[PDB]
Amino acid sequence: KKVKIAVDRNPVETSFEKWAKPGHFSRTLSKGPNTTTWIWNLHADAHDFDSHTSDLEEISRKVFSAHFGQLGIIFIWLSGMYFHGARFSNYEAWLSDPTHIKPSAQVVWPIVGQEILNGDVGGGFQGIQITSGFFQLWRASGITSELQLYTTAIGGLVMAAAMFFAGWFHYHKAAPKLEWFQNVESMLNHHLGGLLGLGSLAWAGHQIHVSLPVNKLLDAGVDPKEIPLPHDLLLNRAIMADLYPSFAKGIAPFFTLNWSEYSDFLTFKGGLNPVTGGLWLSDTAHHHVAIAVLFLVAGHMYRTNWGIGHSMKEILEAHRGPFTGEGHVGLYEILTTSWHAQLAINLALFGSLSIIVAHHMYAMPPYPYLATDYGTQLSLFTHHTWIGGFCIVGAGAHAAIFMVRDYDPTNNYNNLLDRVIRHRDAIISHLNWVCIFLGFHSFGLYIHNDTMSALGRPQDMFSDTAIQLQPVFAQWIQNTHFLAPQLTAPNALAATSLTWGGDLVAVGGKVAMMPISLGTSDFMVHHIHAFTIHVTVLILLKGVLFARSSRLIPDKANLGFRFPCDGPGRGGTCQVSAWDHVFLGLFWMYNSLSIVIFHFSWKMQSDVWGTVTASGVSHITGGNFAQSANTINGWLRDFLWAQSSQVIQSYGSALSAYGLIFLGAHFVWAFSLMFLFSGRGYWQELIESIVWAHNKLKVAPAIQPRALSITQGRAVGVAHYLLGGIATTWSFFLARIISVG
Amino acid sequence: IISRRESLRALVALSGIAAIVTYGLKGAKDADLPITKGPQTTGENGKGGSV
Amino acid sequence: KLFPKFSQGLAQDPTTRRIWYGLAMAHDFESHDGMTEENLYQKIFASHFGQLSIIFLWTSGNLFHVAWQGNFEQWVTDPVHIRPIAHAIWDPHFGQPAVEAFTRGGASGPVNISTSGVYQWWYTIGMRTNQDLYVGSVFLALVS
Amino acid sequence: GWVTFYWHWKHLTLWQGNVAQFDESSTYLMGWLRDYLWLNSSQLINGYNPFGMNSLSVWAWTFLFGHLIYATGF
Amino acid sequence: DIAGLTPCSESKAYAKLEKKELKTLEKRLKQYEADSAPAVALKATMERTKARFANYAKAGLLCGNDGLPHLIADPGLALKYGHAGEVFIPTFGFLYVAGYIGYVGRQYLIAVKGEAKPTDKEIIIDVPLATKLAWQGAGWPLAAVQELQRGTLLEKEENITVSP
Amino acid sequence: AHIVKIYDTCIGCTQCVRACPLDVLEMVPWDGCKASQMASAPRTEDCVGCKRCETACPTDFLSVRVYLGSESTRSMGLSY
Amino acid sequence: AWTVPTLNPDTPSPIFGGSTGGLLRKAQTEEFYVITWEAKKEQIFEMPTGGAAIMRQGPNLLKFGKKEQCLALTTQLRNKFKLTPCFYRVFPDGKVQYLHPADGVYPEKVNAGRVGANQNMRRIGQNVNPIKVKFSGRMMSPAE
Ligand code: CLA
Ligand code: CLA
Ligand code: CLA
Ligand SMILES: CCCCCCCCCCCCO[C@H]1O[C@H](CO)[C@@H](O[C@H]2O[C@H](CO)[C@@H](O)[C@H](O)[C@H]2O)[C@H](O)[C@H]1O
Ligand SMILES: CC1=C(C/C=C(\C)CCC[C@H](C)CCC[C@H](C)CCCC(C)C)C(=O)c2ccccc2C1=O
């Protein structure tokens, strides 16, 4: 059996002896400090497992049990939210009136006057109005009681200690060998089939047998203490046949292939559930069934111990063409003896999945009473774009680390990876052009509209009453996908969302989802998005391809991944390393994603969100997006100034914490400019002047004060730039959208 | 007319002469330059609000 | 090769920072090539004439555009409600709403309200008529 | 910038007449933000809009022009 | 009434703002049953609030044009008019604790340099040593001014310089 | 043409020469050290001034020393 | 025994399909630097201009546009593979100049017969003040 369990018994003694000696992992740190750069290099090099040792087996065991540590912390984090969902919440009261009672699950302690953050969220309850949307998960899960939240919180603590056991066991007691990890055929067969396939089979079975009969009784209208408990929905088939009359046929229509007889509770409805605003749950049930059958089929693709199935070395080495030399030869060997090469491809798509998730959830809101909660909708979009955006920059960072550390010029000869480096000047320069092309022809349209509107020439702007730049292609797709149930998807009862066209869903006198009409302001801002992503690509891909060498510095890989510079010579070589390109890319990721979440938070408030009266529905900001997003001054006036009037005068209320962090993150943002502008050799000399006054009063420390390193003072700078930048928009968005929505 | 460098330097400069010295009087189009118009209705009010 | 006449070490520079450092250390007289201390003080002393001749040409410019395009003779009589005028506007990029929105202060064409406040300084040192302001402009233009 | 924020805003509240609107709000930094920068930039940023424009549009344009040179400095 | 001021027990914008806050709490209190803990919490907020106004007027805090407690940070105008508790008492209540933390941290660094490698005992704080200096540093001004008289507080020009 | 001038505090451990990415430095005999050698810079026409030499000198207040002078097409590190 | 080897361009290049990081128009006007080594066996090195080239047995001729691009090639040819290369400097009038083992022995080891230029028989802390070297024709460091 080439695919087999292979571990090593007791590699590391479970002992506190190495906790006594910090910096024990590295040669350069184990000799103790003499300098405050020791304790920063301790935390910097702590999880740099490739730099501790050279053994790939010892690296692999370290990242395998650290992943149990991250999963074990997520299980604490989930079990916190079910516990704070249970003991300090209004989820009992929220289910009876989920239109007026604001979701709240954080309650503060009345000490310094901070009990004013316990707002009047309704439901006989005081607490911080949450926006993470767990109450919409739980109605979609059919929880209906705070007993169920408490039992799955205890189930979360149990699972977290099991995950902490597992990382302890699979590192200290019985840790795997190297060729266990290098069975990537067996890993994908198990993860596509068992994790993704059987997971969505199991969750569909939760949706068939628990969530569908509970949420059918909630939509038909039953108080949640009167609904049958979901174990009674298992043991009694006669209850299920009352709601969906095809459970009386049992599981006979499945094996007799009479699957059309399951049409009551596996549907293809589409659109939205008009009672609750969310997606249809029977639609999501047939979703996760058909997802599961797809992944279990795809989970039997790769060859492990019997000759059937594909082998990824042969799949890669066969796809070779006349333009690319050897083709994909040698990519299997570098995606199996390098974690950073795995981590780059993983963080790319997993970050790109998060932005797929964010865009597919305002438009197709999967949870009951999710869409009318405008606070949850704004946060669940905004969060999952940022979490995507960091992970995409992490793809650029750890691809560069592959090029510096784990790249092998020997085994990479005239494959794709060798030929990308050999025309890396053509790659960056044609990308340099299209960023400059997108720079003028997207942002200069805004400067044109600023100038024409300031010069009293509104007929010469780029707007709808002026030179019209319509998004012809995206308006064409909305005319097709709304007409898709006509003949291209004839079994759909409605469209796949309501952005494509049609009518709105009114739930509780508020718009769940209405159609989105794209205009010239939507044209300009989508090309702003194309601009900022191509520049973010430009910086990160320059760091990947010029990680090893350039015409500037030929021996750059010998200097490593994270170095400051090569000195002031040849004009200056500040920020030439591949660390420094993923330093600069974080600002453009910040610059790209801020305009994404600004274009979300103002298109929805102008053209989607708002109260409906069946009398000419009014939106939140009155319908002023295409009227005003032509100009930078429109983004200044109508978005950053008009909508800031709920974060600046929110004092004396529960939203006053958002007013503090609005000033708090305006501080921390600007605090970063002390680090982003200045440099070390100033601050080291200033320390010498104050070590002098500490020498004079005999309080000279033994761990000697040094200024922060060159790369560290940059890394402190971009960390406080992003923390002060994002938490500004966090508190701006939430203090806006909790009040007006 | 012009074939060398200093002949072309004269012709570009004299063509810049011939446009601009006319543009102030004959070349200010009725639709292009609203400053070269007549004094229209109002505008000469105080700066607003208070003093 | 010729533009930094002061620094021949910049004249041997084949790159484009030759232009940038020809500008920025052109007034760093202590580091020019062949500079002596008698040659140092003479270029500083003539440059102070260059600063003075700019200031008086600048101030004679303020006296001219107020005397010609300003409303100083109208502002003398009512110095509270009439707003001051710096210099009239000729921007051919304007539109017609941007002509009539900048006509203010009782003037004919578009104007700029002078916030520098040289009317209040001139009104209290005896200036009353525009003919007293042209004479001051021609005087400083001679002195410049 | 700190001496001129304090000069201007104590003089705005003096010249408007609401001399107590400073002393209530100058004691804490939100009143610097929502009563001096937010409140007094109402007619500035309205120098040009899609409704029209007025005499403040040359100072409205420069106010965005100043933010542009500033950020180009970073 | 020291510098254009007034006692907060005597001003009326102070009492107007007290009645402003209790108005906001009571119109927030009205949404709940009289047994409910979201109303028990708000009535406990009021009795912390109303005692707070009673205690600020009890201490004789100075209000002004805005009806807020204004502080007088000058001895001779606080000692004379009975306001040393505003600034002049906590300016020594602080500077006891401040130089306490300084002296304990001083004595820990002085008594660690005579060792094998003192940099190790700035990571790993000798807790039986550090707590011992923590308790016995409680008379630190009595110990510092005796060290101030010797010349052992100030190290001489053994200190490190660049180019004098 | 950058100005590289070294000093008598050299000990001749020749780490500056091995660190120089442009062969500016070489090792000349000199009796003022145990290793009987002191560096020399006969090729400062080729120097960029990237200061990899004086990142590598062990001696306090570095023995090798680079003064950034006037930049030719070799000092700016140009393939063009 | 050693003196000044010459060049023939007949010697074969490494097998490399060409990169865009190679020479530029500076090679046709100013200078370009060629590098030679004698390889024992056929193996795969990294080009300093990005990519990977394979060396062949015998002499190997390669050309670059910088001096660091050649010495960052010998650095991985001497430390990794224990070869002994040497690179030259070719001018577009055909003139060639010998550069790296300029007296045969590599510059980390003493040749006892190379001349100690650019040295100060004094300590770096014993420089003069810039007031003494002021007005030295051009701007001048006190370390001269
Ligand atoms: C799957 C996720 C993942 C994983 C496993 C890694 C793993 C690694 N990364 Mg990596 N990275 C990721 C995502 C990931 N990264 C992303 C998303 C980015 C883009 C932001 C980067 C950018 C990046 C860079 C630029 C570098 C690494 C480095 C490293 C290595 C060592 C990290 C270390 O020891 O730091 C230990 C952990 C810390 C020092 C903590 C950092 C403190 C953060 C910045 C503060 C923020 C915390 C919180 C959000 C703020 C609120 C806290 C509150 C108290 C205020 C290790 C291989 C380094 C490396 O390989 O060096 C050669 C390196 O230089 N990564
Ligand atoms: C069908 C079997 C199966 C399943 C379900 C998984 C599941 C998982 N593997 Mg995995 N793996 C498998 C087979 C399987 N593996 C095989 C055969 C190999 C060898 C080729 C590996 C090698 C491997 C590596 C190297 C890594 C994983 C990781 C992961 C986790 C992904 C993290 C995530 O997305 O959260 C999903 C989380 C959940 C679904 C929560 C449920 C967790 C369950 C209870 C544990 C997984 C089931 C377990 C494999 C069955 C054995 C039970 C145990 C008692 C013996 C996830 C728990 C990564 C990880 O997180 O490390 C810990 C990781 O680094 N796997
Ligand atoms: C608002 C501030 C600002 C501006 C304008 C720029 C501008 C630019 N950056 Mg940039 N940058 C900034 C802040 C800014 N940056 C910050 C804060 C950082 C820190 C991390 C960076 C980091 C950064 C990197 C890392 C990169 C850029 C890049 C670019 C260029 C791409 C855009 C382009 O070509 O469009 C064209 C220019 C504009 C749209 C500016 C407005 C000009 C208008 C439209 C017309 C021009 C006026 C006209 C000619 C009239 C002239 C009058 C006459 C008298 C002269 C461009 C030069 C990328 C680059 O150079 O490659 C493409 C790149 O790689 N920048
Ligand atoms: C993990 C293994 C995968 C398979 C999943 C098994 C999960 C365990 C579920 C056990 C719960 C009991 O499930 C099962 O109980 C009863 C006994 O047939 C069935 O109940 C049915 O059968 C009884 C006798 O036949 C009658 O009262 C009715 O026909 C009807 O109530 C339920 O339709 C079914 O839900
Ligand atoms: C301010 C600044 C510094 C100075 C920052 C100093 C060195 C560090 C800031 C304080 C550190 C975090 C020490 C404070 C906490 C210590 C652990 C001591 C704790 C003692 C009590 C507070 C518990 C730099 O070193 C620097 C370097 C490069 C570019 C820019 C800069 C820069 O802008």
Side-chain angles (χ1 to χ4, degrees), chain A residues 659-673:
Chain A
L660 290 180
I661 308 166
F662 186 73
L663 289 180
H666 271 88
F667 181 75
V668 183
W669 181 83
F671 182 76
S672 68
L673 303 180

PDB file of all heavy atoms in Angstrom, chain A residues 659-673:
ATOM      1  N   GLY A 659     -19.074  56.062  17.790  1.00  0.00           N
ATOM      2  CA  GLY A 659     -18.509  57.391  17.676  1.00  0.00           C
ATOM      3  C   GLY A 659     -17.122  57.479  18.263  1.00  0.00           C
ATOM      4  O   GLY A 659     -16.309  58.291  17.823  1.00  0.00           O
ATOM      5  N   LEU A 660     -16.826  56.644  19.253  1.00  0.00           N
ATOM      6  CA  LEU A 660     -15.503  56.661  19.852  1.00  0.00           C
ATOM      7  C   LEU A 660     -14.476  56.041  18.925  1.00  0.00           C
ATOM      8  O   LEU A 660     -13.417  56.624  18.684  1.00  0.00           O
ATOM      9  CB  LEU A 660     -15.514  55.927  21.188  1.00  0.00           C
ATOM     10  CG  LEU A 660     -16.261  56.627  22.311  1.00  0.00           C
ATOM     11  CD1 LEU A 660     -16.196  55.793  23.552  1.00  0.00           C
ATOM     12  CD2 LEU A 660     -15.657  57.983  22.555  1.00  0.00           C
ATOM     13  N   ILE A 661     -14.786  54.864  18.386  1.00  0.00           N
ATOM     14  CA  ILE A 661     -13.868  54.157  17.501  1.00  0.00           C
ATOM     15  C   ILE A 661     -13.736  54.891  16.172  1.00  0.00           C
ATOM     16  O   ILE A 661     -12.711  54.782  15.498  1.00  0.00           O
ATOM     17  CB  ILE A 661     -14.357  52.715  17.332  1.00  0.00           C
ATOM     18  CG1 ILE A 661     -14.585  52.096  18.698  1.00  0.00           C
ATOM     19  CG2 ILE A 661     -13.318  51.862  16.665  1.00  0.00           C
ATOM     20  CD1 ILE A 661     -15.359  50.819  18.647  1.00  0.00           C
ATOM     21  N   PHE A 662     -14.750  55.668  15.792  1.00  0.00           N
ATOM     22  CA  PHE A 662     -14.615  56.579  14.669  1.00  0.00           C
ATOM     23  C   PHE A 662     -13.516  57.601  14.922  1.00  0.00           C
ATOM     24  O   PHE A 662     -12.683  57.856  14.044  1.00  0.00           O
ATOM     25  CB  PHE A 662     -15.947  57.273  14.417  1.00  0.00           C
ATOM     26  CG  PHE A 662     -15.976  58.127  13.216  1.00  0.00           C
ATOM     27  CD1 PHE A 662     -16.006  57.556  11.964  1.00  0.00           C
ATOM     28  CD2 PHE A 662     -16.018  59.499  13.328  1.00  0.00           C
ATOM     29  CE1 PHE A 662     -16.051  58.336  10.842  1.00  0.00           C
ATOM     30  CE2 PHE A 662     -16.062  60.286  12.206  1.00  0.00           C
ATOM     31  CZ  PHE A 662     -16.077  59.701  10.962  1.00  0.00           C
ATOM     32  N   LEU A 663     -13.460  58.152  16.128  1.00  0.00           N
ATOM     33  CA  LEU A 663     -12.293  58.928  16.515  1.00  0.00           C
ATOM     34  C   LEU A 663     -11.123  58.041  16.883  1.00  0.00           C
ATOM     35  O   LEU A 663      -9.974  58.470  16.765  1.00  0.00           O
ATOM     36  CB  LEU A 663     -12.584  59.819  17.714  1.00  0.00           C
ATOM     37  CG  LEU A 663     -13.473  61.023  17.580  1.00  0.00           C
ATOM     38  CD1 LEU A 663     -13.550  61.692  18.937  1.00  0.00           C
ATOM     39  CD2 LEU A 663     -12.882  61.946  16.556  1.00  0.00           C
ATOM     40  N   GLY A 664     -11.397  56.837  17.378  1.00  0.00           N
ATOM     41  CA  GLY A 664     -10.321  55.949  17.773  1.00  0.00           C
ATOM     42  C   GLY A 664      -9.503  55.493  16.588  1.00  0.00           C
ATOM     43  O   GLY A 664      -8.277  55.557  16.606  1.00  0.00           O
ATOM     44  N   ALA A 665     -10.169  55.079  15.528  1.00  0.00           N
ATOM     45  CA  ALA A 665      -9.443  54.634  14.361  1.00  0.00           C
ATOM     46  C   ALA A 665      -8.961  55.780  13.490  1.00  0.00           C
ATOM     47  O   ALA A 665      -8.002  55.591  12.745  1.00  0.00           O
ATOM     48  CB  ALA A 665     -10.309  53.686  13.563  1.00  0.00           C
ATOM     49  N   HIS A 666      -9.581  56.965  13.561  1.00  0.00           N
ATOM     50  CA  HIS A 666      -8.944  58.146  12.983  1.00  0.00           C
ATOM     51  C   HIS A 666      -7.628  58.460  13.665  1.00  0.00           C
ATOM     52  O   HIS A 666      -6.744  59.055  13.050  1.00  0.00           O
ATOM     53  CB  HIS A 666      -9.844  59.374  13.064  1.00  0.00           C
ATOM     54  CG  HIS A 666     -10.758  59.558  11.895  1.00  0.00           C
ATOM     55  ND1 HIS A 666     -12.012  58.996  11.823  1.00  0.00           N
ATOM     56  CD2 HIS A 666     -10.608  60.288  10.766  1.00  0.00           C
ATOM     57  CE1 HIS A 666     -12.587  59.354  10.688  1.00  0.00           C
ATOM     58  NE2 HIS A 666     -11.754  60.136  10.026  1.00  0.00           N
ATOM     59  N   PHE A 667      -7.486  58.094  14.934  1.00  0.00           N
ATOM     60  CA  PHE A 667      -6.215  58.275  15.619  1.00  0.00           C
ATOM     61  C   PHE A 667      -5.198  57.251  15.149  1.00  0.00           C
ATOM     62  O   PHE A 667      -4.085  57.609  14.751  1.00  0.00           O
ATOM     63  CB  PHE A 667      -6.425  58.176  17.125  1.00  0.00           C
ATOM     64  CG  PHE A 667      -5.186  58.374  17.920  1.00  0.00           C
ATOM     65  CD1 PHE A 667      -4.653  59.633  18.074  1.00  0.00           C
ATOM     66  CD2 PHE A 667      -4.567  57.304  18.530  1.00  0.00           C
ATOM     67  CE1 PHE A 667      -3.518  59.821  18.817  1.00  0.00           C
ATOM     68  CE2 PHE A 667      -3.431  57.489  19.276  1.00  0.00           C
ATOM     69  CZ  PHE A 667      -2.907  58.748  19.418  1.00  0.00           C
ATOM     70  N   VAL A 668      -5.575  55.968  15.180  1.00  0.00           N
ATOM     71  CA  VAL A 668      -4.632  54.878  14.933  1.00  0.00           C
ATOM     72  C   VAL A 668      -4.163  54.889  13.486  1.00  0.00           C
ATOM     73  O   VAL A 668      -3.010  54.554  13.192  1.00  0.00           O
ATOM     74  CB  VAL A 668      -5.274  53.534  15.317  1.00  0.00           C
ATOM     75  CG1 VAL A 668      -4.313  52.400  15.154  1.00  0.00           C
ATOM     76  CG2 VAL A 668      -5.713  53.570  16.725  1.00  0.00           C
ATOM     77  N   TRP A 669      -5.041  55.293  12.567  1.00  0.00           N
ATOM     78  CA  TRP A 669      -4.656  55.512  11.178  1.00  0.00           C
ATOM     79  C   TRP A 669      -3.548  56.538  11.069  1.00  0.00           C
ATOM     80  O   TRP A 669      -2.523  56.306  10.428  1.00  0.00           O
ATOM     81  CB  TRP A 669      -5.844  56.017  10.386  1.00  0.00           C
ATOM     82  CG  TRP A 669      -5.564  56.235   8.961  1.00  0.00           C
ATOM     83  CD1 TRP A 669      -5.575  55.301   7.989  1.00  0.00           C
ATOM     84  CD2 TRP A 669      -5.162  57.457   8.341  1.00  0.00           C
ATOM     85  NE1 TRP A 669      -5.264  55.870   6.789  1.00  0.00           N
ATOM     86  CE2 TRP A 669      -4.985  57.193   6.985  1.00  0.00           C
ATOM     87  CE3 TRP A 669      -4.950  58.752   8.801  1.00  0.00           C
ATOM     88  CZ2 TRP A 669      -4.608  58.169   6.085  1.00  0.00           C
ATOM     89  CZ3 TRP A 669      -4.578  59.717   7.907  1.00  0.00           C
ATOM     90  CH2 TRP A 669      -4.411  59.423   6.566  1.00  0.00           C
ATOM     91  N   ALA A 670      -3.758  57.690  11.692  1.00  0.00           N
ATOM     92  CA  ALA A 670      -2.785  58.760  11.604  1.00  0.00           C
ATOM     93  C   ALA A 670      -1.561  58.453  12.422  1.00  0.00           C
ATOM     94  O   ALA A 670      -0.480  58.965  12.129  1.00  0.00           O
ATOM     95  CB  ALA A 670      -3.409  60.055  12.074  1.00  0.00           C
ATOM     96  N   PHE A 671      -1.722  57.615  13.439  1.00  0.00           N
ATOM     97  CA  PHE A 671      -0.601  57.151  14.238  1.00  0.00           C
ATOM     98  C   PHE A 671       0.375  56.346  13.398  1.00  0.00           C
ATOM     99  O   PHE A 671       1.584  56.367  13.647  1.00  0.00           O
ATOM    100  CB  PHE A 671      -1.145  56.326  15.390  1.00  0.00           C
ATOM    101  CG  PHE A 671      -0.115  55.828  16.309  1.00  0.00           C
ATOM    102  CD1 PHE A 671       0.472  56.671  17.215  1.00  0.00           C
ATOM    103  CD2 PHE A 671       0.259  54.506  16.282  1.00  0.00           C
ATOM    104  CE1 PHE A 671       1.411  56.212  18.071  1.00  0.00           C
ATOM    105  CE2 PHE A 671       1.201  54.048  17.133  1.00  0.00           C
ATOM    106  CZ  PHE A 671       1.786  54.907  18.018  1.00  0.00           C
ATOM    107  N   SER A 672      -0.135  55.641  12.390  1.00  0.00           N
ATOM    108  CA  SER A 672       0.696  54.844  11.504  1.00  0.00           C
ATOM    109  C   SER A 672       1.608  55.686  10.642  1.00  0.00           C
ATOM    110  O   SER A 672       2.663  55.203  10.226  1.00  0.00           O
ATOM    111  CB  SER A 672      -0.172  54.019  10.585  1.00  0.00           C
ATOM    112  OG  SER A 672      -0.855  54.861   9.685  1.00  0.00           O
ATOM    113  N   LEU A 673       1.229  56.930  10.364  1.00  0.00           N
ATOM    114  CA  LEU A 673       2.046  57.786   9.523  1.00  0.00           C
ATOM    115  C   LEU A 673       3.334  58.200  10.209  1.00  0.00           C
ATOM    116  O   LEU A 673       4.258  58.656   9.536  1.00  0.00           O
ATOM    117  CB  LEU A 673       1.250  59.015   9.118  1.00  0.00           C
ATOM    118  CG  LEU A 673      -0.055  58.681   8.409  1.00  0.00           C
ATOM    119  CD1 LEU A 673      -0.780  59.950   8.056  1.00  0.00           C
ATOM    120  CD2 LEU A 673       0.161  57.824   7.191  1.00  0.00           C
TER     121      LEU A 673
END
